[PDB]
C-alpha cells in the first residue's frame, strides 16, 4: 500500500535528520508540502529549501540544521474546534509549549498558535516538534 506524497516527504526528512544527513531530496512535490515546509522553516526546524522544476510533479531539496526531532502527518483529517485546540495539543505533543500542531483552516495551512491568533479553525494536517 502506497503512502501519500506528504507522508513520504515527512518520512524522508525524519530519516535524513536522524541519520545525520545534511540535505534531503524529496520527490514528488506539491503545494501542501511547500506550505508545510514553509511553516517548519518559519519556526526554524529546517534551513533553506530549494524547488527544482522538472516539468513533472517536481523535486525539492531541504537543508537540515539538526533542530528537527520529528514530523508527522495525522489522519483521518478530523475537524477541531478552536477552543478544543489546547486539548489536542496536550495529547499530540511532548509538553505544553514544545512543538506546533499544523492545521488546515479557512485562511490556509498554519500552526495552531497562529490559528488561535486569527480565531480560525478547521481540520488538522500534522504535527512537528
Amino acid at each position: 500500500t502506497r503512502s501519500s506524497v506528504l507522508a513520504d516527504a515527512l518520512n524522508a526528512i525524519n530519516n535524513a535528520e536522524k541519520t545525520g544527513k545534511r540535505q534531503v531530496l524529496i520527490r514528488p512535490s506539491s503545494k501542501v508540502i511547500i506550505k508545510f515546509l514553509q511553516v517548519m522553516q518559519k519556526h526554524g526546524y529546517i534551513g533553506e529549501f530549494e524547488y527544482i522544476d522538472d516539468h513533472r510533479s517536481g523535486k525539492i531539496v531541504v537543508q537540515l540544521n539538526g533542530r528537527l526531532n520529528k514530523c508527522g502527518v495525522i489522519s483521518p483529517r478530523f475537524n477541531v474546534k478552536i477552543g478544543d485546540i489546547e486539548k489536542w495539543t496536550a495529547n499530540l505533543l511532548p509538553a505544553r509549549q514544545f512543538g506546533y500542531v499544523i492545521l488546515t483552516t479557512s485562511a490556509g495551512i498554519m500552526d495552531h498558535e497562529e490559528a488561535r491568533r486569527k480565531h480560525v479553525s478547521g481540520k488538522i494536517l500534522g504535527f512537528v516538534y
Binding site: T1, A7, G72, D84, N91, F127, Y129
Partner: protein, 33 residues
Amino acid sequence: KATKRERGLKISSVGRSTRNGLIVSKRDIARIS
C-alpha cells in the same frame, strides 16, 4: 549482541504510528472533543 537496543522515550499517546502517518481512531476523536 544480547542487549536489546535502547528504544528512546515515548513522546505521544493519541494513536498508532504507521508509514502513512499517525492514525487516530474515531473513538479517540470523540473522547478528546
